Amino acid sequence: GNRTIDLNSLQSTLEKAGPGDTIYIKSGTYTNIQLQLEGYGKVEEPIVVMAQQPGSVFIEGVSNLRLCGEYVEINGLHFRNGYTPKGAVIEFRNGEKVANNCRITDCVIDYFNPIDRGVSGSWILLYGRNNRLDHNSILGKLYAGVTLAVILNGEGDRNNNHRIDHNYFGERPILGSNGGETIRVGTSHHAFFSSNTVIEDNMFHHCNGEVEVVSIKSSDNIIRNNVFLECRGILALRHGNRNLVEGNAFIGNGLPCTGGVRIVNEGHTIKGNLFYGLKGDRFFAALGLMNAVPNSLPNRYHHVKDVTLEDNRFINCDNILFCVGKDNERTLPPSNISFIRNQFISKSDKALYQSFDDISGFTFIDNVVNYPYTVTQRGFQNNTTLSDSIDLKPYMEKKNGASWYTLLVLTGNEISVKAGQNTLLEALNQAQSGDILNLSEEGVYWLDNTLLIDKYIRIQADSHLSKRPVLCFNGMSGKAFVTIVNGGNLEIQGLAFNGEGEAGKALSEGGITVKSGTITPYLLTVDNCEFYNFNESGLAAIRGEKSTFSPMVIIRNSFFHDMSGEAINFAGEKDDKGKYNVEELHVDNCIFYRLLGSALNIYRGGNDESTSGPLLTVDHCTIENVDNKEQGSAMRLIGVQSATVTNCSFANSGKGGASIRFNEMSWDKLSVSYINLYNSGRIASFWGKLGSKNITNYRPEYVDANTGNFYQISTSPLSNKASDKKDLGITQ
Ligand SMILES: [Ca+2]
């Protein structure tokens, strides 16, 4: 019954296959193939569909797979360079039939994404009973939707005893919204049903989609012996009762937003887990036992009770939170909680645990602690001999992923660009990824079209020039000077952007923008650039459009002036559904002068608790005559979960509204210090708790604001008053 066929004949061949047959798949690249598979083996003799040699059967293009029947194994498929058109990439069902006792192993899904970010769907969907998903490598999902979900819609899908083991769940970048889980087991609608799913011996590496790496929303599951290495997320016991969390390793290595386990519901056991180097806070914390809503509806937060945590090791964990989430709705503290024989070791002077409500429901027995201070809590014992040295390699040596599967730098090439009609446009089109475009002479670099950045490129002014090369737009249809699309990564330095507008030609739509729907995460670095003469209110010099995302945007040493619109806009997600477009934005040593719109506008709206960002740092910026209209904001930072504004100067700005505006949650980490505000609007927030470390009101004294020199004169009271002893505002 052994056959060696190509993939197109698999469906009819699998139907004719009998128990024990082996169907070998010829090597090749199959494009636009929707496999609908049905086969029936038996417990002693399964039907094995295998790549003739694994790792050389490529399923590309508009493709997906559906599997139903009994005792059918599929081995050695490689999904890449394509996208699923309808459901998931792999489903354990086919029409109305499900797959039982089937197995998908030694397969790879590798950046199986479409070209537009504005879609949502899964990659692997589990149905039926007693199916196994093992030794697979899944990585690179760039759009919304959980990577792998266990569905419990029908009785045939519940009490599944599905085994998700020895897989490598690789990089999943920050989605910027809810819906970026790597694994979800159940939903709120079937939460109190038993799923009996086993997730064991898996490797979660850089699974950073959202707060939940694994979202358990069903009952009586087992999550054991997994490794979460540097994941910006947690294991969430979100819905359902009696889940077992045993022998897992949460290895954050001191990286940001790394967490462990967040607990809701009743009856769980958390035993023998390693919590190592976790920096996450609140819902990202190393450990969290939530407050709950009394008599909660199915989709809210149910009472945490009858939970035993024993023989866990909390090594260098920043935040261990009891009653986390307490507010006017989640008013019910955990009850009948037992911490037994746990080990707490930390080198930092953070609290052992933090409580946000009464913890009378907690019992502590024979816990041992080694912190830099003496713990005087009943049920804890200090031991200064405990070492925070841990042997992590037993977690790093475990075999995971497909057996045959293994796995932003310059080229060094520089392209000189003279001035002319389209010198920069043709230099970019001749450039490879990693090339440097060196504008070699001063003058006007005209552009009839946008510079489309679909690769990694660096555009710089030659270091010998004494003035910034000026970019001007003389096209017939409105575009931005630079447009980042799929695959683009941009560092730009020393360039001036003049959107003046030419006679008889279209107006430019901004300086740098990222095309909406761009599915590849992009990096943007702007250094010593200039933006001016954009004279419509709806434009921005630098804009991250809706349905785009960057993990890191850096803007430094730049000059934004004489514009009717904004300078930096990352406020496109206006639907108040928790979405945002930049994880970390850093603004350094920038001048904002004579703008009708905001110097900076970042927005994340809604009450969603599923994300970490955006994070913002603003340092040594000078804001002069910016956004004085009624209810304007010189800086609009709504929903920024972490903001640090330091060593800045606001003058004659925000007079009709606010110089800096927040609409913050009480737990948002906002730090506004060393700010000079002269004849400017107030620093506006909802709770009024930003404090007032070094808030001055001196009159700034520029060297020569007419020639663009906004440094302070040496005798100005803004001199040497920054926290780093440099100048308030731009400096050095
Ligand atoms: Ca979620």
From TrEMBL:
GO molecular function: metal ion binding
InterPro entries hit by this protein: PbH1, Pectin_lyas_fold, Pectin_lyase_fold/virulence, PL-6
One Pfam family it belongs to: Chondroitinas_B
Protein origin, superkingdom: Bacteria
PROSITE patterns associated with the record: PROKAR_LIPOPROTEIN
Annotated binding of Ca(2+), by residue: N178, E181, E210, E212
Keywords, ordered alphabetically: Calcium, Metal-binding, Signal
Keyword Metal-binding: yes
Name assigned to this protein: Poly(Beta-D-mannuronate) lyase
